[PDB]
Amino acid sequence: IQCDLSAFPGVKFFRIEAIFRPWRLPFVIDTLSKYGIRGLTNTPVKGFGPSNLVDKEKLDIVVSRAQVDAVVRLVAASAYTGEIGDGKIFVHPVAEVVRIRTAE
Amino acid sequence: SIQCDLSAFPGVKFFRIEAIFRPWRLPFVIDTLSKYGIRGLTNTPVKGVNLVDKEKLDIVVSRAQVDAVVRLVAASAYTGEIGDGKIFVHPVAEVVRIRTAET
Amino acid sequence: DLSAFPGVKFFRIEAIFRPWRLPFVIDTLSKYGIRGLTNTPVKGVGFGPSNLVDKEKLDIVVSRAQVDAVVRLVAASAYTGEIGDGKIFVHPVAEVVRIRTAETGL
């Protein structure tokens, strides 16, 4: 996996958003935590009509430009089950990151 | 018709359309999208602020589809009364399918 | 610094912080005049031992000129000074459409 970030010259940070099967959540969290990635935020979400709404898990992680490929690979590998419906990972550009405790 | 200004994002191939609207209109918006052949909707209940329940729906679509999809959502969520909500269009740098590793 | 996004008019401020600070952040923003806040409960991560911790997410879309002031107000209101106060992210937005009117931009 190699993400093309060429449309965002100068962008230092990106958000990795993964939407995947709920039962894989602990596996993804464990992988990321063991690799030293922090800042995970998890939201339960739903992903034909409303009857076809099923539970999914959303995980967002902000990383630096140079980290994107490695982190996407970790997430994909742990969310993977080899079957249709495994979900998708989206990479979004971020303009600024501010830590509340130390902000001006 | 609605024409979204994507001019500040040249070379961006995918965009996320995020709609925040009345919860009772969820089935109508979903049906409209399904009929047009959209897949991959994510829905989150959220609150607006006097905190009021709203429904959020996100869809990632190709650049060429943005206007058509924005129009469809706008149309189906519309009532004309104050509080109908908003649609935001966001740039997406990459899309990766978990099962295949394809980008 | 927003200089990697020339041409972008609107930005989304996303704050992820302690739930007990939520009423304070809302009041601060309201009194200041900010409208259009959206709030979502989310979970942070604190096999191997990890723990999901409740957080509040607040999103506000503002004009480029309003970004610094709004980020400051949110930081000030969400702060406690202890480890675990959370983060504020600023994201570029391409378009804003008001459903009632089909108005875009502003």
Give the sign of the dihedral formed by CA A29, CA A31, CA A32, CA A36: positive
The alpha-carbon gap from B72 to the nearest alpha carbon of chain A, in Å, equals 16
Cβ of B89 under 8 Å from any chain C Cβ? Answer: yes
What determination technique applies here?
X-ray
Which chains pack against A, by 3+ Cβ pairs within 8 A?
B, C
Cβ of A101 under 8 Å from any chain C Cβ? Answer: yes
Question: How many residues does the structure list for chain C?
Answer: 106
Report helix angle B66-77 to B26-36, nearest 10: 150
The alpha-carbon gap from C85 to the nearest alpha carbon of chain B, in Å, equals 22
Query: How many domains does chain A fold into?
Result: 1
Neighbours of B80 (CB within 10 A): 8
The alpha-carbon gap from A95 to the nearest alpha carbon of chain B, in Å, equals 12
Q: What's the CA gap between A78 and A89, in Å, rounded?
A: 12
Measure CB to CB from residue B46 to each of C30, C39, C61 and give the nearest one.
Answer: C39
Cβ distance C89 to A15 less than 8 Å, yes or no, reads yes
The alpha-carbon gap from C103 to the nearest alpha carbon of chain A, in Å, equals 25
Q: CATH number for the domain including C96? A: 3.30.70.120
User: Which pair of tokens denotes residue C45?
Assistant: 């991560």
Q: What's the CA gap between A66 and C80, in Å, rounded?
A: 32
Q: Closest chain B residue to C11 measured between Cα atoms?
A: B90
Asked whether the beta carbons of C72 and A52 are under 8 A apart, the reply is: no
Asked whether the beta carbons of A83 and A7 are under 8 A apart, the reply is: no
User: Which pair of tokens denotes residue C25?
Assistant: 């952040």
Asked whether the beta carbons of B59 and B17 are under 8 A apart, the reply is: yes
Three-state secondary-structure class, residue B52 = strand
Q: Closest chain C residue to B81 measured between Cα atoms?
A: C100
Q: Which of residues 58 through 77 in chain B touch A, CB cutoff 8 A?
A: 60
Neighbours of B49 (CB within 10 A): 19
Three-state secondary-structure class, residue B78 = coil
Q: What's the CA gap between B56 and A33, in Å, rounded?
A: 29
Question: How many residues does the structure list for chain A?
Answer: 104
Q: Which domain holds residue B21?
A: 1-103
The 3-class secondary structure across chain C, one letter per residue, is CCCCCCCCCEEEEEEEECHHHHHHHHHHHHHHCCCCCEEEEEEEECCCCCCEEEEEEEEEEEEHHHHHHHHHHHHHHHCCCCCCCCEEEEEEECEEEECCCCEECC
Q: For C93, how many CA atoms within 13 A lie in the half-sphere containing its CB?
A: 27
Asked whether the beta carbons of C25 and C74 are under 8 A apart, the reply is: yes
